[PDB]
């Protein structure tokens, strides 16, 4: 009956994890054990992907989401994203999975054996939710840990082999970064970009220099904020603005995570730099641009002058102007002219697509890529019939980009619900009317009528 | 005590599952509606009536199995097992669609049974029969859609087949041939169903969020005794909330639950009426004024004209296989299609 | 006190006929701007080139529409996802042609309705209520974000957003069926369960409570006068409603705890509509409904059609006619 039932803890079984709010030691076990589960999944899944992986098929034809994350970091891959050594995948797999068991061990110990509460066993680890200095110190420690993590990525890019660079010539290759971008006009210019079409806020980051440099700033920002918070206490204004409770902090983080999942969703959908299409398949925009390219190529070979071909509407069948005048591909893909990709940028001139380059300079590798991408557009059914909704069964494909974007939208939505739930409850519980209205002091009864 | 009175006694006994006189109709017809559905989606084909597979046995899954309508060539036959078509031959009955009428008509009498059961139990417990009255809207829907609609058409072929995807096909048939989305009776039915869903959600959430603190735990469910006198939530704080949030609010609890009955019940009834019209092809298909203008002015376009073009694609692309008994042969060159697709 | 405190006190005052509040400070202007633009565009705006192909669709009453056909038309596919404020146009005339009202209306509307939701929380805090009505509203709110914002994002264009009209909505639904087989998507099947069940449970609850109203009136007055606003005691006999409904089905398929019964009413539709808003939101990224086209074949290999194949013939009809002039290439990849 150490809490652990409804009579003593006030929560029913279906909200039993709320019994842990003031049991710091059992609560510590739940988190470590749960971290165990996360690192387990990273490990089991990667090995699962390795066992099912055929290096001759594209990654995106084989249902892989984690190995492409490893390949983007520059392991196991060569020019054009060819897989040249699977051994590093194995290693990531086994090390996470082994590690899950130590995590596993530590969480189950703390949740069962160890002190239910920590605050008398050692004054450093034990905490009170309402201790504003202790909370900001934990925040600060985790800040520093995050800041280190960001600098680990920098270290891989600059000192430990580099990153896959889809924009590197010859069709992409791993490449060490030596001139990260530090100019904060650039690094923070991304934050002030519009999230709308043709700007894309931070999703638009299109080169590895900006990526590495952003992670220098963020690492140092997190390490400096960690110290700040370890040494400081919240100022008067901030104390008066927030609710200071276990559940409120939880709601602030659910808020954060929601915001981040939605951003992730748009990252994997639109960005082909840190989600290379070699690995994740083409973006929706990319596949649609690629179709127009493919049919431009076919018809030009037959004799069509593609710059002067008027389509049915009066717009060019292959090429038209965007609303600011740029030469772009025609047809419905006119919405996608913001697309930029390595297969396509060689045809680009100062005024957009260049007709002389189109008439003379299309290489067979661009034709291949454009045909490959047009036929791996991220459309497919839930049971993995690839193509439009009216396609016949045959092709067993759904793009990793669809899988990663749908899963994380779903996840980010429910975590915003969680935020509203727990934020609301935290406010009510702090005011002391979360169990209902006090009959003997019903607030509206002491208020004047509206009319 | 006469024998009728003794049989009453036993039928109206308080048991785990009340029976009643209404049971004599309800339980047998319901079981057989259910049974023939399960039986027929598990084992029976639609090959001879539709040119379709329709059972687990043939490789269909839960979404694509159906007990499909009889062939158009049966007209509106009752398709009795002992009737002129199947002549007592069970296998032939299954093959000619007899399970559809079996389900259709046993289901109908089962719904009757259920409403009578609602009436019978109300009377013995002594409550008003508003629930039985509320059940009239599901009955109007069932009768309109499954019986009246095909009786106005050429045959039972065009009634709904009893299947998840069969019903989706019916939905789309109704768009492409009846332009049923444009029909004001359907539109009222949509209002009643989405509005009922709304009332359901907003009423439940208001009660849950105006509760009084009648216990001391964080699980608020345990602070309710079904025999208490007092309202378990505050009508007064509910009213003020919604008055200031939305401008008006319920102030009368009886009217509020009467409205919850009225809205979805009246909406299903309105939709029933539109389907009775469609039994006759008496559709709201067109707006004549738009057509006279569009015919004369090739630059006039609206969402109304865009949707008919879609209707037109549905009819021509789906009819040959959806109505195989017509032997529709549409050469490629007659199929309506936009550019490229 | 000082000026800022008087203002804060009026803003958050529980004595205003309509609660304003901090969320209300953003909601009021944004809803007013959306509504005024909408009313004026619906009546008077000239044709809009939704599909960016110089083929304007007339949506307004003065250009030959009625209530059922009229709409505020989505902005041009040529614009895609670019921001198109009035001040980015060279003239109002260009803005009207290219569908700018639509952008102005949906953005102000999404913002104001986001704050309508926060206002619901906020007033409940000032009244000492529990806070989760706004959670319930999140289901319809999420739904609106899906058709007006998420689905444009996945598809690259607000021109594929749901039109602001009665027939425009139907257009949106038909096209969506052809490109996504939403009927075969479980999340939409969950939405239909949500709203059919919502309406079922609505009618049930109203019918069952109304059945057990306590004789408090004569047969010549409305039974509704048996209830007096604020009254301490309940006006129906839940024990009687359970006794009826438990016998209708069986005793434990019936609720006897009023709080559990009302929580069920809240949760059933809210959850279902969450799923259907997630349905639109994930089909935005082309994870479409189940595809069982030519799924059954015979020993030789002939296709044995199912109802799924029949649905696919309808789908193909919608596909090949929609936006009949906008495709130059064979696959409709967005």
């Amino acid at each position: 009956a150490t809490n652990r039932d409804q009579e003593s803890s006030g929560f029913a079984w279906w909200a039993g994890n709320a019994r842990l709010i003031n049991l710091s030691g059992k609560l510590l076990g739940a988190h470590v054990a749960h971290a165990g589960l996360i690192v387990f999944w990273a490990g089991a899944m990667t090995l699962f992907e390795l066992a099912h992986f055929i290096p001759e098929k594209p990654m995106y034809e084989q249902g892989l989401i984690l190995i492409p994350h490893i390949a983007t970091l520059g392991w196991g891959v060569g020019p054009g994203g060819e897989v040249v050594d699977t051994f590093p995948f194995f290693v990531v797999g086994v090390v996470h999975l082994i590690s899950s068991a130590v995590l596993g061990f530590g969480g189950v110990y703390h949740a069962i054996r160890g002190p239910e509460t920590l605050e008398e066993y050692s004054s450093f680890f034990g905490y009170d939710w309402k201790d504003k200095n202790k909370m900001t110190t934990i925040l600060g420690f985790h800040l520093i840990v995050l800041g280190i993590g960001a600098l680990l990525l920098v270290a891989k890019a600059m000192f430990f082999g580099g990153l896959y660079d889809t924009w590197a010539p010859g069709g992409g290759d791993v490449r060490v970064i030596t001139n990260p971008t530090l100019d904060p006009r650039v690094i923070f210019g991304y934050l002030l970009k519009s999230p709308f079409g043709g700007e894309g806020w931070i999703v638009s980051v299109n080169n590895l220099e900006d990526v590495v440099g952003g992670h220098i700033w963020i690492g140092l920002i997190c390490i400096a904020g960690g110290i700040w918070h370890i040494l400081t206490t919240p100022f008067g204004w901030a104390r008066r603005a927030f609710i200071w409770s276990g559940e409120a902090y939880l709601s602030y983080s659910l808020g954060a995570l929601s915001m981040m999942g939605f951003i992730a969703t748009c990252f994997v959908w639109f960005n082909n730099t840190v989600y290379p299409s070699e690995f994740y398949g083409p973006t929706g925009p990319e596949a649609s641009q690629a179709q127009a390219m493919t049919f431009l190529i076919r018809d030009q070979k037959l004799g069509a002058n593609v710059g002067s071909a008027q389509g049915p509407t009066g717009l060019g069948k292959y090429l038209m102007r965007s609303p600011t005048g740029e030469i772009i591909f025609g047809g419905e893909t006119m919405r996608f002219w913001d697309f930029r990709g390595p297969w396509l940028e060689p045809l680009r001139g100062p005024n957009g697509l260049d007709l002389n380059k189109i008439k003379n300079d299309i290489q067979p590798w661009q034709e291949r890529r454009a045909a490959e991408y047009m036929t791996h557009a991220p459309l497919g059914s839930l049971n993995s019939v690839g193509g439009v909704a009216t396609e016949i069964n045959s092709v067993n494909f759904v793009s990793p980009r669809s899988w990663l974007a749908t899963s994380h939208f779903v996840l980010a939505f429910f975590f915003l619900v969680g935020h509203l739930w727990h934020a609301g409850r935290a406010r009510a519980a702090a005011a002391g009317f979360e169990k209902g209205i006090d009959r003997e002091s019903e607030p509206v009864l002491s208020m004047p009528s509206l009319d | 005590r006469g024998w009728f009175d003794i049989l009453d006694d036993w039928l109206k006994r308080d048991r785990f599952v009340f029976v009643g006189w209404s049971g004599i109709l309800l339980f047998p017809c319901a079981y057989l509606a259910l049974g023939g559905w399960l039986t027929g989606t598990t084992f029976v084909t639609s090959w001879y009536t539709h040119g379709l597979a329709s059972s687990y046995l043939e490789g269909c899954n839960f979404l694509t199995v159906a007990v499909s309508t009889p062939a158009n060539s049966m007209g509106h036959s009752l398709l009795l097992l002992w009737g002129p078509e199947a002549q007592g031959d069970f296998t032939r009955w299954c093959q000619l669609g007899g399970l559809w009428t079996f389900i259709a008509l046993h289901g109908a009498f089962g719904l009757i049974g259920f409403m009578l059961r609602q009436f019978e139990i109300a009377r013995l417990v002594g409550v008003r029969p508003y629930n039985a009255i509320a059940f009239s809207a599901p009955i109007a829907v069932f009768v309109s859609v499954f019986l009246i609609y095909p009786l106005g058409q050429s045959s039972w072929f065009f009634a709904p087949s009893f299947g998840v995807a069969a019903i989706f096909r019916f939905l789309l048939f109704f768009q492409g041939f009846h332009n049923w989305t444009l029909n004001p009776f359907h539109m009222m039915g949509v209002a009643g169903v989405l509005g009922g869903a709304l009332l359901c959600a907003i009423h439940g959430a208001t009660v849950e969020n105006t509760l009084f603190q009648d216990g001391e735990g964080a699980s608020t469910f345990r602070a309710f005794n079904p025999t208490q006198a007092e309202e378990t939530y505050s009508m007064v704080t509910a009213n003020r909330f919604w008055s200031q949030i939305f401008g008006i609010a319920f102030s009368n609890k009886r009217w509020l639950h009467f409205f919850m009955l009225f809205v979805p019940v009246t909406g299903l009834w309105m939709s029933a009426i539109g389907v009775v019209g469609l039994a006759l092809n008496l559709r709201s298909y067109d707006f004549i004024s738009q057509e006279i203008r569009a015919a004369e002015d090739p630059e006039f376009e609206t969402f109304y004209t865009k949707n008919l073009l879609l209707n037109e694609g549905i009819r021509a692309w789906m009819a040959p296989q959806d109505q195989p008994h017509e032997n529709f042969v549409f050469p490629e060159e007659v199929l309506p299609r936009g550019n490229a697709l | 006190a000082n000026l800022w405190e008087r203002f804060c006190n009026w803003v958050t005052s529980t004595d205003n006929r309509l609660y304003v509040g901090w969320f209300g400070v953003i909601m009021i202007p944004t809803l007013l701007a959306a509504t005024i633009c909408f009313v004026i565009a619906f009546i008077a705006a000239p044709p809009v080139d939704i599909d960016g192909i110089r083929e304007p669709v007339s949506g307004s009453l003065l250009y030959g529409n009625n209530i059922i056909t009229g709409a505020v038309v989505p902005s041009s596919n040529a614009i895609g996802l670019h921001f198109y404020p009035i001040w980015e146009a060279a003239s109002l005339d260009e803005w009207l042609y290219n569908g700018g009202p639509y952008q102005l209306i949906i953005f102000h509307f999404l913002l104001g309705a986001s704050c309508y939701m926060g206002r619901q929380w906020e007033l409940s805090y000032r009244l000492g209520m529990r806070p989760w009505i706004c959670v319930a509203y999140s289901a319809p709110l999420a739904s609106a974000f899906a058709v007006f914002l998420i689905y444009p994002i996945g598809q690259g264009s607000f021109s594929d957003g749901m039109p602001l009209g009665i027939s425009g909505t139907f257009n949106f639904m038909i096209v969506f069926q052809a490109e996504h087989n939403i009927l075969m998507h479980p999340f939409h099947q969950l939405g239909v369960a949500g709203v059919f069940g919502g309406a079922l449970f609505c009618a049930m609850h109203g019918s069952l409570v109304t059945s057990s109203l306590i004789r408090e009136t004569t047969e010549t007055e409305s039974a509704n006068y048996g209830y007096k606003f604020g009254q301490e005691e309940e006006t129906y006999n839940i024990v009687a409603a359970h006794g009826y409904f438990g016998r209708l089905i069986f005793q434990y398929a019936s609720f006897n705890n009023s709080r559990s019964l009302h929580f069920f009413l809240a949760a059933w539709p809210v959850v279902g509509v969450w799923f259907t808003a997630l349905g639109i939101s994930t089909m935005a990224f082309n994870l479409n409904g189940f595809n069982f086209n030519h799924s059954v074949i015979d020993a030789k290999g002939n296709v044995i059609n199912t109802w799924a194949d029949i649905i696919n013939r309808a789908n193909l009809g919608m596909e090949v006619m929609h936006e009949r002039n906008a495709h130059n290439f064979p696959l409709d990849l967005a």
Binding site: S449, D451 | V236, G247, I248 | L18, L61, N66, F229, G230
Partner: peptide
Amino acid sequence: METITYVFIFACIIALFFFAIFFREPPRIT
């Protein structure tokens, strides 16, 4: 005439809204 008619009905409803909020029967606590 048809535009005027649709606009007039819409405008009557907005006026109904105003009276139904601000000139409602005030709910009172008998």
